[PDB]
Design a protein around this nucleic acid. Structure first.
Lengths: 123, 167, 229, 37, 166, 338
RNA sequence: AUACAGUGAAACUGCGAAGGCUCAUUAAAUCAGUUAUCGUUUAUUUGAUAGUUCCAUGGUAUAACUGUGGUAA
RNA sequence: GAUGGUAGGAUAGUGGCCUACCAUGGUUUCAACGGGUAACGGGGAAUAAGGGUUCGAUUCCGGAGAGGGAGCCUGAGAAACGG
């Protein structure tokens, strides 16, 4: 689990808890995974709001592309055209998310150009 | 040329309009700080030595001490492009400033034989030579500030100790 | 150019008084010029309200604070020396600043919502409020959104009101701004529309936020006196 | 290899300088009989 | 440097027709000061009020930390052999954060002989540098921002973690 | 009268040294000659004025007018530089430590282009106008200033090249590689002509050649190393050479001739701390120019006996030799002060 | 009022001006609200907040000012 | 640099914001991306008026500019209407 230089390690194995109703799996408390930006050990802290939806693609690593269809009460043509949204998300050592898989994410500390959300739950 | 001359310790200074430029030609191609004799600028002031100290040329432009190039050049001074004549003196100076550091063979009824005094004596104590109630009040307010703050801090830290004992 | 909270008549002028910086925010306060001059009318213009501020009649939160645009926000007890004027100003039911008159034993204190508790430096517990009174050493059971009672002679917390299900809460913020009744429901969500819900005359229901609500007492016994109609 | 080696033609340098006809003061025959070996 | 804004570049949707704006003061990218070895010269630049920033260019006196006891002691700099955030950076021999640079470990010899008595439990491939003098150590501090050269020594696991690389 | 360092029966002088009554007898030649604590590279233009000195932190261009004895401007360029040339007057081309290339004009910053790999050296061709840029690897590139194209890059050996130079009277492209081979290409044919190998007698470690030079006869070639060892070369029995170990010997960076002033067959060598000067056909040191700080590189002004270094201190040193030649027309009272 | 003592040209100082016209046409990217910054800067407002001591007071160097001048300026 | 990962640089800091290396991604028929004006008009941007029903109160059209591009400096705040 070390394919890059420069002392791949936690930055002070290490373990913390964001709290607020989201579990930390036992390999993510005491396991060999580094958890650089996975918020359970991580360097990031949790805040903001939590969004939920199924996925479209998980092709690249550390990219979870959620879909999010939601109801909105349209008054214009008085029928509901169905919503769709997208958000990239970093991995977690709890679930290899495949197609389907309604999961939720919490807002924190922009990681790439467009990701502020990291997976905290699978159900 | 005109020669400004200054005898500094007596406090005297006067200009002298010296024509007849082969008298002047002793100063030529001698930059600022290098000394000179009275013998080749005059005969009536022999045994004289003048440290040159710059001079405005015609068109009024000054020379600053020690660069090069006795024509005019455009430098950056106190930062903007100001024109400044070179430190070396040539044929085209209007006035040239001189400090006489040894009187030679003739008295001068402008420089030597006439002098001005200084301005006024010193004002500072150490300059004349060469509070304690505030020292009471400073020390008293300092020890009172200590006996207030460093005791009050522990006086509410003990209230934290009471809250921790009751919790 | 005015907000809604000041109860400011439109036939007044063109430039509206921006409050200066201070304890509260700009959006949740009224300055002393809009307090004294054109609300309870102890002045007629800015010159004479500056004159009485130089005379120093005002004693808001027990200190003088001679300033025209001093942002008196929620329940800062304005104290005026002549005719022993003690004024606690709260929110009414339609968004304005209802300035209730109180007495001396009630203006000897105020209360404040706690915002955060910190282990800041050198082992010192720590508490802030909406006027920012960084007072030393409360108990460990100060959660967010509880209510301290400030001493107003020194700064110490004297009493403490715990935020839980079944407490009398005041809502300052959003579309519920200035309501009282605090019990139909409790619902703590995980990031928004999370609150304790407030009744009405027919005990209707309401939604707000945690930070937009803060406790003032118990079900029938607040030690703040409240105005009536 | 995106920005790496764009084989394009660029606008301000297309006539930034101008060549010279004779150039080298030697001859090309002097080049050949200079480094035959 | 130039910038810090998304306006000059494309987002996750592929947009065009940028032509946006004259760039502001708060998109300030300063020049990349590649810190080297020399005589200690730190430029004291200003930002955000009296926020002085120490931009080190020629720093030497690295405070490098003995790992197993945590003893940050003073030494010199030799050169970085491997740093593929730029593989030309080690060709030019600069000194940035997270670089693995070589140190004449003579004060670490002094501390070992001073708080242990004898000279040489510690690993063998760093005992070879205990004997010879030059040990590998990785910079922690930021000379381009904080102006300092601090670091941590290589002791065993992290040593082989870099020696298998290069 | 400026003081002179001891040497082999010869005199040199420094102006703007680390040490250079003195305040009131100041001997300052060029006003505002000081940088931000170091110096990158200095060179003097082909005409009689306008020397250019590259910057150190917030790196600049610093053109000094010799007939005004001060600074003209300082274009704070975008990145830190390593190598550049001057193309007459106002145009000039630069390349930075990143793989980018700037074209400065009278208005400044006419273009910024790039090369695909990290570059180390640049030279310009007076004939048909293609700048050759040496970089890391198999790659020695061209940017022709005629039609702005790119050209079919010259295929090198493994590691790369430290310095490229073309010969002046006939055009023989040098490229100082890492594996001691000098890789002479032909600027006519765009092909190799020779792969000359460099030898010694000490052989400490596998040195890399870092400096290449020619002169205006077109028959000899001055070679360097990464060890402090000058070399001469001719076509006449091109396998051996004459060599010059230097007494400290880290990396020689500047070896330049004296092929346009008097006191002939003389050459300047320059490694990191010292710069010396010796004679051809014997290999004996004429003089040396020991400063109080290290040297980033040097340059020699044409027609006269003066040198301009770029160093690691705040000012730059100028070195005057009143036996190699006189001081030039804009410095024509240096022979009157010292 | 024989070391200062009121008027006060011209000089240092504290601050003043604390937000004004024309020209080429951007579709929630210009804008408005909102979430957050234990992801960050902050003059001013407000509340808080300092414990290392071997054998009666420290130095020249510049003004303003005088004096000699240059230049059409 | 398109999409992300690792590290460094620069930052007031988050950030492919920039560079080395690596992977070939990402948005879209549930409307990507692109087409124009009564975009001198519109969007609550806001005051509303005791009968004017799209006239009728205002913030903002977009960003720039101090002869022309370029570089630098000052400050709690600037790429300054005053260098």
């Amino acid at each position: 689990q070390s394919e890059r230089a420069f002392q791949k390690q936690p930055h002070i194995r290490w373990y913390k808890n964001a709290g607020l109703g989201f579990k930390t799996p036992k390999t993510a408390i005491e396991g060999s995974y580094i958890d650089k930006k996975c918020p359970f050990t991580g360097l990031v802290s949790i805040r903001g709001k939590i969004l939920t939806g199924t996925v479209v693609s998980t092709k690249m690593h550390r990219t979870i592309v959620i879909r999010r269809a939601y109801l909105h009460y349209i008054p214009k043509y008085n029928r509901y055209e169905k919503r769709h949204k997208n958000v990239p998300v970093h991995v977690s050592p709890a679930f290899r998310v495949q197609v389907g898989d309604i999961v939720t994410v919490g807002q924190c500390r922009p990681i790439s150009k467009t990701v502020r959300f990291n997976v905290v739950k699978v159900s | 040329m005109k020669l400004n001359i200054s005898y500094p310790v007596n406090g005297s200074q006067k200009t002298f309009e010296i024509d007849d430029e082969h008298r002047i030609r002793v100063f030529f191609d001698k930059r600022i700080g290098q000394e000179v004799d009275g013998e080749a600028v005059g005969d009536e002031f022999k045994g004289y030595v003048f440290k040159i100290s710059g001079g405005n040329d015609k068109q009024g432009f000054p020379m600053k001490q020690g660069v090069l190039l006795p024509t005019r050049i455009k430098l950056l001074l106190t930062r903007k492009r100001k024109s400044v004549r070179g430190a070396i003196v040539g044929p085209d100076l209007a006035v040239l400033a001189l400090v006489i550091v040894k009187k030679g063979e003739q008295e001068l009824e402008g420089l030597t034989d006439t002098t001005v005094p200084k301005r006024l004596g010193p004002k500072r104590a150490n300059n004349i030579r060469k509070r304690l109630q505030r020292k009471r009040h400073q020390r008293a307010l300092k020890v009172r500030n200590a006996q207030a703050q460093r005791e009050a801090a522990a006086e509410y830290a003990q209230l934290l100790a009471k809250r921790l004992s009751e919790r | 150019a005015a907000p809604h909270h000041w109860l400011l008549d439109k036939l007044s002028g063109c430039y509206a008084p921006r409050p200066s910086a201070g304890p509260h925010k700009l959006r949740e306060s009224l300055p002393l010029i809009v307090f004294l001059r054109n609300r309870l009318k102890y002045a007629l213009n800015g010159r004479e309200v500056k004159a009485i501020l130089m005379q120093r009649h005002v004693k808001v939160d027990g200190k003088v604070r001679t300033d025209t645009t001093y942002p008196a926000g929620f329940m800062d007890v304005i104290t005026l020396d002549a005719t022993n004027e003690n004024f606690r100003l709260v929110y009414d039911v339609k968004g304005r600043f209802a300035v209730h008159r109180i007495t001396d034993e009630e203006a000897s204190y105020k209360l404040g919502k706690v915002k955060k508790v910190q282990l800041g430096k050198k082992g010192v517990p720590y508490v802030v409020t909406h006027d920012g009174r960084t007072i030393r050493y409360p108990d460990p059971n100060i959660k967010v959104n509880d209510t301290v009672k400030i001493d107003l002679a020194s700064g110490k917390i004297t009493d403490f009101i715990k935020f839980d299900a079944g407490k009398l809460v005041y809502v300052t913020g959003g579309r519920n701004l200035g309501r009282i009744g605090t019990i139909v429901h409790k619902e703590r969500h995980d990031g928004g529309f999370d609150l304790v819900h407030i009744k009405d005359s027919l005990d209707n229901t309401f939604v707000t936020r945690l930070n937009n609500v803060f406790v003032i007492g118990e079900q029938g016994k607040p030690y703040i006196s409240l105005p009536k109609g | 290899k995106g920005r790496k080696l764009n084989y394009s033609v660029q606008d301000p340098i297309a006539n930034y300088e101008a060549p010279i006809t004779s150039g080298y003061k030697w001859s090309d025959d002097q080049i050949d009989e200079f480094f035959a070996g | 440097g130039i910038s810090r804004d998304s306006r000059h570049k494309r987002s996750a949707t592929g947009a065009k027709r940028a032509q946006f704006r004259k760039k502001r003061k708060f998109e300030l990218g300063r020049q990349p000061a590649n810190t080297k070895i020399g005589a200690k010269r730190i430029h004291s630049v200003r930002t955000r009020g009296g926020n002085k920033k120490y931009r080190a260019l020629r720093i030497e006196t690295g405070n490098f930390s003995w790992a197993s006891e945590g003893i940050s002691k003073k030494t010199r700099i030799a050169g970085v052999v491997y740093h593929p955030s730029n593989n030309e950076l080690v060709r030019t021999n600069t000194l940035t954060k997270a670089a693995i640079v070589q140190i004449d470990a003579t004060p670490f010899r002094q501390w070992f002989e001073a708080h242990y008595g004898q000279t040489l439990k510690i690993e063998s491939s760093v005992e070879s540098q205990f004997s010879a003098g030059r040990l590998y150590a990785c910079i922690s501090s930021r000379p381009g921002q904080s102006g300092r050269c601090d670091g941590y020594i290589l002791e065993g696991e992290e040593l082989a973690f870099y020696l298998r690389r290069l | 009268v400026l003081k002179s360092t001891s040497a082999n029966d010869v005199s040199v002088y420094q102006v703007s040294g680390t040490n250079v009554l003195e305040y009131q007898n100041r001997v300052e030649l060029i006003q505002d000659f000081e940088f931000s604590e170091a110096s990158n590279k200095i060179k003097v233009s082909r005409d009689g004025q306008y020397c250019m000195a590259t910057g150190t932190y917030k790196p600049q261009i610093h053109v000094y007018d010799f007939a005004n004895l001060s600074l003209k401007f300082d274009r704070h360029t975008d990145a830190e530089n390593v190598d550049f040339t001057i193309l007459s007057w106002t145009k000039s081309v630069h390349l930075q430590n990143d793989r980018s290339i700037q074209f400065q004009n009278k208005g400044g910053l006419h273009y910024t282009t790039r090369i695909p790999k990290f570059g180390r050296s640049l030279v310009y061709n007076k004939v048909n106008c293609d700048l050759y840029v040496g970089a890391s690897g198999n790659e020695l590139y061209r940017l022709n200033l005629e039609k702005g194209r790119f050209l079919n890059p010259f295929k090198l050996d493994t590691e790369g090249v430290n310095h490229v130079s073309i010969n002046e009277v006939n055009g023989l492209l040098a490229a100082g590689t890492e594996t001691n081979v000098v890789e002479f290409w032909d600027p006519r044919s765009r092909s190799r002509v020779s792969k000359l190998y460099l030898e010694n007698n000490i052989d400490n470690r596998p040195f890399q050649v870092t400096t290449t030079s020619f002169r205006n006869d077109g028959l000899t070639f001055a070679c360097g190393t990464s060890n402090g060892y000058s070399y001469i070369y001719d076509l006449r029995t091109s396998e051996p050479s004459i060599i010059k170990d230097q007494g400290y010997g880290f990396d020689i960076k500047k070896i330049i001739w004296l092929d346009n002033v008097g006191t002939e067959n003389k050459i300047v060598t320059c490694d990191k701390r010292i710069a010396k000067i010796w004679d051809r056909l014997d290999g004996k040191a004429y003089a040396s120019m020991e400063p109080s700080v290290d040297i980033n590189d040097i340059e020699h002004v044409p027609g006269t006996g003066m040198f301009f270094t770029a160093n690691e201190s705040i000012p730059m040193h100028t070195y005057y030799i009143p036996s190699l030649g006189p001081s030039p027309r804009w410095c024509s009272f240096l022979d009157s002060i010292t």
